[PDB]
Design a protein around this ligand. Sequence first.
Ligand code: NA
Ligand code: NA
Ligand code: NA
Ligand code: NA
Lengths: 445, 445
Amino acid sequence: LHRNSLIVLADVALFLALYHFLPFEHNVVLGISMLAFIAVLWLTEALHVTVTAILVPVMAVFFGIFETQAALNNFANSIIFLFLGGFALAAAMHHQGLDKVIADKVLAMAQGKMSVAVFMLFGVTALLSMWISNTATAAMMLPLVLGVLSKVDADKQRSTYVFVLLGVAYSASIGGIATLVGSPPNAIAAAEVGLSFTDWMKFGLPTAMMMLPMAIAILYFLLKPTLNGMFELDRAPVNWDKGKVVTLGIFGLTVFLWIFSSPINAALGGFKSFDTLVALGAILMLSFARVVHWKEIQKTADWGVLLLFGGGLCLSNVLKQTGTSVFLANALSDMVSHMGIFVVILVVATFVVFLTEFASNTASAALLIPVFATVAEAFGMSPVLLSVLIAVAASCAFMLPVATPPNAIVFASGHIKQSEMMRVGLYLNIACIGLLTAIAMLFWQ
Amino acid sequence: LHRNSLIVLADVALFLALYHFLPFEHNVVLGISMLAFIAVLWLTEALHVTVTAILVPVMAVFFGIFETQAALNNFANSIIFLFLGGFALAAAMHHQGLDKVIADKVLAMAQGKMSVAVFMLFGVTALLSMWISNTATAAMMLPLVLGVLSKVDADKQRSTYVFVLLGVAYSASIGGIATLVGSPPNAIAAAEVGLSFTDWMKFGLPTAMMMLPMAIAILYFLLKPTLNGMFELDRAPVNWDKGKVVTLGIFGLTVFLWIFSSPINAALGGFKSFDTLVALGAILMLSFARVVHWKEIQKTADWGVLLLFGGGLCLSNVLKQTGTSVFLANALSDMVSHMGIFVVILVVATFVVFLTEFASNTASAALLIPVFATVAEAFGMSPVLLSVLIAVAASCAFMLPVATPPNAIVFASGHIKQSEMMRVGLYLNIACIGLLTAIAMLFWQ
Ligand code: NA
Ligand code: NA
Ligand code: NA
Ligand code: NA
């Protein structure tokens, strides 16, 4: 009777149709029919992102692509644990309140000026985003933004207080593109192509360094009258208590090891997924140093996302095993030989950046990273470039809400108009496709 | 500075000592030193049960026993997912309220008599326990017990209202021994020896059928004056709403397939971990039929327990790979040849039943099932008997609280004395060691 039940029923019909009607070697039919089925369920989200992910192995297994255990093992991938370390590391510094002190210390650095208030709000949202989440950093930033935007309270004076809202909304998404922990797409890319933490930062951080100014400049050069106003630093001041220095200590050490992982691991005998070990080490150091309880990490952890990771890897393998990867590569062979490498990555970049407006960031990467990376491998090229590209591009949701929760969070603020965001985003999207295709061209040789 | 930090530091010393001082082939030293380390951390619970479990792979990997991914794969074992199915199945019928209606319908079956009130409370606690949890079924039962025990309110008349409290506390633990989902020890045994859902019920259910009457009979034949009193059926009546029949429908179908798994799977082509697939199927049926959301399952799911599962399997493998299983089997060789098979299982059964008073049910099984099952295999015997034995025995916590949360739940009721429970439990423990050794002898040939 419901909308989504129909989407699902329609999808079941679509599969049954594709299955009985496509004219290929049986494996390819099955692979294509599945790829289509899942593609729908993740882009529509008729079933939860995670329920769909659990559906992948169960299909794989029932259609004899893999054996139950083999399909399930997909879920214990090392990256999934590296991401659990991220959740624990965040769990700690939220419950400890280290996210509050980093907000005040940097926010009070601005003596009482609105010019250097919001400009220090975007820098904090993005910095906090690098390690925490996008949705978490958005909902955590909202009261701190509405707090500041209460002196220039006149909401007939909207564009002073819309530049500041939509600013952090993007700063949370752009801050996600900094490191391997931060947003699921990045992790999906890492798991698909086997990136180290320090590998995804070599790509991502320079892009966030570039993108955040470019995003503010575009929001700025629309309707900003913010060079005026005063502050209201209203609430109890913060102070480093029982080892917020310790949480910072562990965090710092953890980040240090993640960066210097290459020479540390190499000069240790070369352990296998050193970054995942570091991440698990953090979960231990944080528990031995008593700084955060487990129930805290179990609440903070988005296990739904952790299951999505495995389900998407399961899919990636379903594509190889059924040969659907090679079949598509054969089909696209003429199209891609006629297209220049510029043309291809411009088309890829454009596609995602606009697709990601219609569906979840991760849900988009969950679908696209496998399809592309595997087809890339069928062409005998390194699946890294396309994957990292899609990873970044999926986190470029700037037009409407529903694109990302961070958009729908500053939107429920019953103030910003649908039309307004839709056109700053339309600009920033094109602006991004430039920067990405640009940087993607640069990181070639 | 804290107690547990010292326990941990002492343990680190113990390891360092055992490591540098034991006189064996290096692998055995490492294995023994590890086995001792983890043994402590799970029995003391100086670190959380789950943090310790995460510690197992990280050790294994660092001490070159396994490669990072190999050790981590331990966590994607099919049983872990079967148990996630259990969490989802419970999540549904709690949020749906099917646990409330099963309580009232069966509780109001008793017209208004205290004699058939508490006797229908134990039967419901145990029945509800089979599928939900122990701790969850205890905390859910407490208000419903205090509700009834308010007509015979005189707490100078204690033993009317202590028999009813300590009754459900045990009924929740004994109801856990019915099926594979229900209490983690049971799952640990299943994962160690590869039991099917229907396999653990063949053992377990007859034991719960036997044990629950035997437990009431012992609580009864102490200080019961409950053949007197009246009811107070006070609260809004229940009624089957938007497919509580559907949740019951899915649940029923799921349980049906779990029982008939052998012939259904065999007459389906023999899929690998059919019970796990059934469990995942339940997660899907429950979501497609819209009866429960995902965030609900993510709250209900004890991911901490799910991680514990894998960490304990990682341990089991650590023992084999380092040959510590074979080394202990060699050491116990003379002791066990001098001991009759009765003697052995009487010693095993006694050991756990009393050990489980001092530490968590699961924490006990997490340590003991691997050590025994593997040593059993070194002797070239089926690891099943010993494992299933330990699994049941670990859920026999009847003496003090701290033994199980269900004990500490009816204890905070600021009414039951330390001494009182300690002696009913001392009787029931011996009573159990009889029944177990008895049944364990019977299920031999
Ligand atoms: Na982020
Ligand atoms: Na998106
Ligand atoms: Na139970
Ligand atoms: Na116990």
